[PDB]
Structure 1
Amino acid sequence: ETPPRFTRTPVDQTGVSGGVASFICQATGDPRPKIVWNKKGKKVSNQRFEVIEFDDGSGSVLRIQPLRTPRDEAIYECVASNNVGEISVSTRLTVLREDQIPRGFPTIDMGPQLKVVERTRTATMLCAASGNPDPEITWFKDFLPVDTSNNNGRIKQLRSESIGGTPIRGALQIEQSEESDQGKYECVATNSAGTRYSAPANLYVRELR
């Protein structure tokens, strides 16, 4: 038996009213730790707050949609626990009004679109975003973050080499498509000013001819 230890801690977010915010928390231990989301010590409970579990059981995502200001603006915490031990990590949510949005906040110039790929062929979701500073593009599938961490993986992330003037191009490339890849993908643009979500796009996988 080992106590819970974090493999992924949530980071502070600055979102925009009516939009989405996702907090990620993953831990490991023996037995498998449970994860709970709190605000001021109290487990969150709210129609607009959804906790989505990883298939691994490695953790959960706290998703707030649509964002409301100033109610949602607060300090939240992830708490991981089993009978051997307990660990927690805090995180801040900030929500701005669109009228309040600064020059240099990420915008989605174009977001992913409905795509139908047959099984085992490559499917690509495209995202174009801009901002100052230049935004990082990340991906979420069915409310969980797409992991492109490992190179030589089935799923890879492409990034525009970037001349100054145009939006940044980002893509999610899924080789050897399978039925489990089917789902609702959304692109996410982030910089030091904040975070913005594209609209959702479904990927369908039809049978190989």
Structure 2
Amino acid sequence: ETPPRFTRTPVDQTGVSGGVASFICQATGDPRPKIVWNKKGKKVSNQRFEVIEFDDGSGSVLRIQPLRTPRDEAIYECVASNNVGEISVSTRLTVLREDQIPRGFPTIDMGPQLKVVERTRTATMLCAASGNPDPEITWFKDFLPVDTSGRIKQLRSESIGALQIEQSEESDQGKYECVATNSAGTRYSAPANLYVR
């Protein structure tokens, strides 16, 4: 038996009012750590705050949608625990008004669109995004981050970000969101469905 240890700690988010923010927290340990999200020390307990567990039990994502300001702006804590010990770490959510959104805050110029791929063929989800600094584009599938490092690869060029899913299969079906992030903040695309025919 071993105490909880973090494998992925949440990273500060600046979102826009009405938009989305996600925080990721994973840990290992034996027995399997329970992950609880707190807001300034109390368990999160509001309808717009949703905890989605990774299928493998490694942890969870706290997803907040729609973001409200000033209400949601706070320090949040991820607490990992089992019968041998407990650890926590915190992260910060900032939520900007339209009135407060910087010039270079990421824009989704073109979000992903509905796709149907034949099984074993490459599916490509597309996202055009811009901002200053040039934002990083990442992908969420069914509210969880798509990690890619390789059947599933992410390609990137000027404002275009692509998620290429080689040898597509049934489990790749789902709801994909493009996420654009830079030092000014994080913007989500509307989700697009992928089907595997």
Do these two structures clear the TM 0.5 threshold for a shared fold by scoring above it? yes
RMSD of the TM alignment (CA)? 1.1
1:51 is displaced (CA, Å) by: 0.1
Shift of the alpha carbon at 1:99?
2.3
Separation of aligned partners in 1, 2:182 and 2:41: 29
TM-score by length of 1: 0.92
Q: Deviations over 1:15-51 (max 9, x none)?
A: 0000000000000011110100001221100000000
TM-score normalised according to structure 2 size: 0.97
SS of the residue aligned with 2:121? coil
> Which 5+ residue runs of structure 2 have no aligned equivalent?
none
Q: Which runs of 4+ in 1 moved over 2 A?
A: none
Aligned to 1:199: 190
Q: Which runs of 5+ in 1 are unaligned?
A: 163-169
Mapped to 1, the partners of 2:82 and 2:74 lie a distance apart of: 26
CA shift digits 1:183-205 (9 cap, x unpaired)? 00000000000000011000011
Match of 1:154 in 2: 151
Quote how far apart the aligned CAs of 1:159 are.
1.0
How many percent identity over aligned positions?
A: 100
What's the counterpart of residue 99 of structure 2? Answer: 99
User: What is the Cα deviation at residue 118 of structure 1?
Assistant: 1.2
| 3-state DSSP of counterpart to 1:180 | helix
3-state secondary structure, aligned to 2:171: helix
Report the alpha carbon displacement of residue 100 of structure 1 after superposing the two structures with TM: 1.6
In structure 1, how many angstroms separate the alpha carbons of the residues matched to 2:126 and 2:39? 35
* Cα distance between partner residues in 2 of 1:54 and 1:161: 32
Aligned length: 196
- Relative to structure 1, the CA distance from residue 114 to residue 73 in structure 2 (aligned partners, 3 Å threshold; closer, same or farther) is same
- Of 157, 166, 173 in structure 1, the residue corresponding to residue 164 of structure 2 is 173
Shift of residue 161 of structure 1? 5.6
Cα deviation, 1:140-197, whole Å, max 9, x if unaligned, reads 0000000113xxx1100101167xxxxxxx1101011111100000000000000000
